[PDB]
Scaffold this active site. Structure first.
Site, PDB file in Angstrom:
ATOM      1  N   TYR A 115       0.104   1.722  17.030  1.00  0.00           N
ATOM      2  CA  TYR A 115       1.128   0.920  17.695  1.00  0.00           C
ATOM      3  C   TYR A 115       1.593   1.551  19.005  1.00  0.00           C
ATOM      4  O   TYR A 115       2.101   0.850  19.883  1.00  0.00           O
ATOM      5  CB  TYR A 115       2.341   0.710  16.781  1.00  0.00           C
ATOM      6  CG  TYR A 115       2.118  -0.227  15.610  1.00  0.00           C
ATOM      7  CD1 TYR A 115       3.135  -0.460  14.684  1.00  0.00           C
ATOM      8  CD2 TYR A 115       0.895  -0.877  15.423  1.00  0.00           C
ATOM      9  CE1 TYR A 115       2.942  -1.311  13.603  1.00  0.00           C
ATOM     10  CE2 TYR A 115       0.693  -1.730  14.349  1.00  0.00           C
ATOM     11  CZ  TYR A 115       1.720  -1.943  13.442  1.00  0.00           C
ATOM     12  OH  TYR A 115       1.524  -2.777  12.366  1.00  0.00           O
ATOM     13  N   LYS A 174      -7.359   6.360   5.040  1.00  0.00           N
ATOM     14  CA  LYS A 174      -8.716   5.830   5.073  1.00  0.00           C
ATOM     15  C   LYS A 174      -9.603   7.044   5.387  1.00  0.00           C
ATOM     16  O   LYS A 174     -10.436   7.022   6.289  1.00  0.00           O
ATOM     17  CB  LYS A 174      -8.852   4.735   6.138  1.00  0.00           C
ATOM     18  CG  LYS A 174      -9.497   3.466   5.620  1.00  0.00           C
ATOM     19  CD  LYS A 174     -10.830   3.770   4.970  1.00  0.00           C
ATOM     20  CE  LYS A 174     -11.458   2.531   4.362  1.00  0.00           C
ATOM     21  NZ  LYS A 174     -10.542   1.864   3.390  1.00  0.00           N
ATOM     22  N   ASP A 225      -7.183   0.269   1.297  1.00  0.00           N
ATOM     23  CA  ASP A 225      -7.749  -0.922   0.676  1.00  0.00           C
ATOM     24  C   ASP A 225      -7.638  -0.892  -0.852  1.00  0.00           C
ATOM     25  O   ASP A 225      -7.417  -1.927  -1.480  1.00  0.00           O
ATOM     26  CB  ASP A 225      -9.196  -1.125   1.122  1.00  0.00           C
ATOM     27  CG  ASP A 225     -10.088   0.049   0.778  1.00  0.00           C
ATOM     28  OD1 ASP A 225      -9.640   1.208   0.866  1.00  0.00           O
ATOM     29  OD2 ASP A 225     -11.258  -0.198   0.421  1.00  0.00           O
ATOM     30  N   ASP A 231       3.133  -0.581   7.512  1.00  0.00           N
ATOM     31  CA  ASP A 231       3.660  -1.867   7.925  1.00  0.00           C
ATOM     32  C   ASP A 231       3.095  -2.963   7.003  1.00  0.00           C
ATOM     33  O   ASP A 231       3.825  -3.815   6.509  1.00  0.00           O
ATOM     34  CB  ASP A 231       3.268  -2.107   9.379  1.00  0.00           C
ATOM     35  CG  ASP A 231       4.101  -3.175  10.048  1.00  0.00           C
ATOM     36  OD1 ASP A 231       3.747  -3.565  11.176  1.00  0.00           O
ATOM     37  OD2 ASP A 231       5.111  -3.621   9.464  1.00  0.00           O
ATOM     38  N   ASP A 264       5.293  -4.789   3.560  1.00  0.00           N
ATOM     39  CA  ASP A 264       5.394  -6.231   3.446  1.00  0.00           C
ATOM     40  C   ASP A 264       4.774  -6.733   2.146  1.00  0.00           C
ATOM     41  O   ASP A 264       5.355  -7.578   1.467  1.00  0.00           O
ATOM     42  CB  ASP A 264       4.768  -6.904   4.669  1.00  0.00           C
ATOM     43  CG  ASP A 264       5.635  -6.777   5.917  1.00  0.00           C
ATOM     44  OD1 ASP A 264       6.819  -6.375   5.803  1.00  0.00           O
ATOM     45  OD2 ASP A 264       5.136  -7.099   7.017  1.00  0.00           O
TER      46      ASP A 264
END
Lengths: 345, 345
Positions: free
Chosen positions: A139, A185, A217, A241, A245
């Protein structure tokens, strides 16, 4: 304990006052030495001072030990210059206090499994705390760009960035079920492996907390299949993020979730819901998120874990006894609050 | 129609033969002119030729119109040089055919909502197809690196990469409910905006398909809250990797999901489940995924959508009539297959 209260717009003043009623109640019961002062912030601030985060408020948060935020924003200010929007003042607040971690809990209160999109069997017992890194990552990574033919963004992390967010997760885990899961990851990305290495190193200073590693994942599958088996989850910006959610839908109602931002400066506790201006002043606004932010404040800002759990068990009962309109009840803000206080003894 | 069949290891030969029984059945019923030949691949290939993807097989896939893959891998080959592992031969296969898109469908068959981790009300009707970009993104982006103090990885995408994956999604949507949703992080990343721009441009040549855009984090919430409202979903590598896995848990059983990889060369259709060697030769292996890969083949490789739907309705009934052991039934491979054929008329 000094608390800076920033009511904000819409239902902010109503729900924040609901939380203060609980805090003051506890203060008389345990003599916490609670001292607070409310300051302008958000639209109210723009309308009164011209800026969403006026200096007296900046001084207020600087001198305070915690910030109890209400709700900012409203259609009224959406059509304004970005530099002076209520949303901007919110970003400024976080910068001034160098808050690098975002705590987003998702829990299914006993008896409320019905609201979850997950089967009751699987929704039962969920109590996860996602710790998301806020300052680094893709970001804010550079180089970044875009042309007529290509686009690029960089997921970059330095050791200090990973070390600090990792620490609030361990420190935050000791206050809960002493189990942290670091998401990455690592099996594909250099940043993943680096993140994994660093957190594994950091964990050595926390022998009383168990550390586990998971791939983003795989973690996405786990949050839907067996969310109840997790306690504290720490991860990067974009990964956190997405995961915050995902986990937020688990309870089945956005109106019950609080949040907090930790860092070098004064902590900020705030309810995740919007300002809902069309309901401002009618009563009826569900104070749950605000009261839970008050609990989060006690736990993370002052270490009063036992008191936080007490307030948590209080609202939990309240939700079943006098459900707020949103949960199909009819108990207004004050009614609900009264029930909570009723269980705070 | 020429089909290259690569049975593979473990239950591969059993489940693949189950799919062939369905295909041959249809061939007699519709005169599809089905012509196939089986080739060595995976562990069987290593044991017989020394390499998991021997040249006669390479020639076989090159000359074939579609590939029906079984299952490769097994503890037996895990301790071997990477260059000759069964997993590697699988990667080689995709490279030789320049397969850039990965199709992963997740559907809750009528009557099987019970297996989903989601409430029946919300699990009902789910039929989503995630199209994931396989060649570009952060998984292969440069520059990438790591040092004692920092680590970096690049999410990069060129216009052609986005254009091609986007096209298989539209083409794939016309065969379904003509609705595509492109996932990105446009509100924060340059790559997101670029991806959004390109897909919006590409869509102009597909007036009969409706295009919608969604942010990855929002899409994560939607897949748990209202997965049934989506048809085709197209997105980047890492984003599609997370989303495919999230969606795969929806049905509540990994053994029923097929997959396909599309690109410039011969398409590859394969069941998502492992080889389960400890069950090889006993019968009992659930052929659902393999039969569904056969259906995927008809739809995407030959355009026989109506026949694919026929096979799909067949297995759907079979699952209820003679549930496989994994769904609490006792119907072995052959038993289940017979039921499917029974509904293929």
């Amino acid at each position: 304990m000094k608390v800076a209260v920033l009511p904000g717009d819409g239902i902010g003043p109503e729900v924040t006052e609901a939380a203060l009623k609980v805090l003051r109640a506890l203060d008389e019961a345990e003599g916490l030495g609670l001292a607070y002062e409310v300051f302008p912030f958000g639209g109210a601030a723009i309308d009164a001072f011209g800026e969403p985060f006026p200096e007296p408020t900046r001084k207020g948060v600087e001198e305070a030990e915690a910030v109890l935020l209400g709700s900012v924003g409203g259609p009224k200010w959406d059509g304004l210059p970005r530099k002076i929007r209520p949303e901007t003042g919110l970003l400024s607040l976080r910068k001034s206090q160098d808050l690098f971690a975002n705590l987003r809990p998702a829990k299914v209160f006993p008896g409320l499994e019905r609201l979850s999109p997950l089967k009751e069997e699987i929704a039962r017992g969920v109590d996860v705390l996602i710790v998301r890194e806020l300052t680094g990552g893709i970001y804010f990574g550079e180089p970044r760009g875009m042309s007529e033919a290509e686009a690029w963004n960089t997921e970059r992390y330095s050791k200090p960035e990973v070390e600090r967010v990792a620490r609030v997760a361990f420190e935050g885990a000791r206050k809960r079920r002493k189990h942290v899961v670091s998401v990455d990851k690592a099996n594909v990305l250099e940043v993943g492996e680096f993140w994994r290495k660093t957190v594994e190193e950091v964990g050595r200073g926390y022998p009383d907390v168990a550390l586990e590693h998971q791939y983003v994942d795989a973690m996405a599958m786990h949050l839907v299949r067996s969310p109840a088996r997790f306690d504290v989850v720490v991860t990067g910006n974009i990964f956190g993020d997405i995961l915050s959610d995902l986990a937020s839908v688990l309870p089945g109602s956005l109106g019950l979730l609080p949040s907090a931002s930790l860092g070098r400066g004064t902590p900020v506790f705030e309810p995740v819901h919007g300002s809902a201006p069309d309901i401002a002043g009618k009563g009826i606004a569900n104070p749950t998120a605000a009261i839970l932010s008050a609990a989060m404040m006690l736990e993370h800002a002052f270490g009063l874990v036992e008191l936080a759990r007490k307030v948590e068990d209080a609202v939990a009962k309240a939700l079943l006894e006098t459900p707020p309109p949103d949960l199909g009840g009819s108990a207004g803000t004050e009614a609900f609050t009264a029930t909570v206080l009723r269980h705070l003894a």
